[PDB]
């Protein structure tokens, strides 16, 4: 399968700042981040556990796993993540 799915998440924080959760400032609309299924900011070209093929598929270890924006909130409990918007990419099909 392909590790091309990701989410664009806009949120506010009760504690900490956007950088603490590897997000970027989007003042005056909070923070924005692009995550993989593990609820962590995307760190490669795709959301594989490791490298992917030319299409973003057949990645080493398959795709990062988890419950998406819900996991982003969960793992960042200490910051109090207030979700505003979530967009699933690829959006169109």
Numbering used by the authors: 25 to 117
Published text:
The CG11501 gene was identified as a negative regulator of the JAK/STAT signaling pathway in this study, although its precise molecular function is still unknown. The overall structure shows a relatively elongated shape with approximate dimensions of 60×40×40 Å3, which can be divided into two sub-domains referred as SD1 and SD2.
Form A crystals belonged to the orthorhombic space group P212121, with unit-cell parameters a = 29.83 Å, b = 44.30 Å and c = 58.54 Å. The structure was solved by the SIRAS method using an iodo derivative and was refined to an R factor of 12.9% and an R-free factor of 15.1% to 1.15 Å resolution. The final model for form A includes the entire expressed protein from residue 25 to 115, the 24 first residues being the signal peptide that is cleaved upon exportation, two extra residues (116 and 117) being cloning artifacts, one thiocyanate molecule, one ethylene glycol molecule and 144 water molecules. The SD1 sub-domain is made of two segments 29–59 and 90–117, and is composed of a four stranded anti parallel β-sheet (30–35, 48–49, 55–59, 109–113), one α-helix (92–99) and two 310 turns (43–46 and 100–103). The SD2 sub-domain is formed by the first four N-terminal residues (25–28) and by a long loop (residues 60 to 89) connecting the strand β3 and the α-helix of the sub-domain SD1. This domain is highly reticulated with four disulfide bridges; two of them tether the loop 60–89 to the N-terminal residues. The main structural difference is located in the loop 51–54 with a distance between the Cα atoms of more than 5 Å for the residue 53. Indeed this residue is in cis conformation in form A and in trans conformation in form B. Nevertheless positioning the structure found in form A in the crystal packing of form B leads to several clashes (distance below 1.5 Å) between Pro52 and Gly85 of a symmetry related molecule.
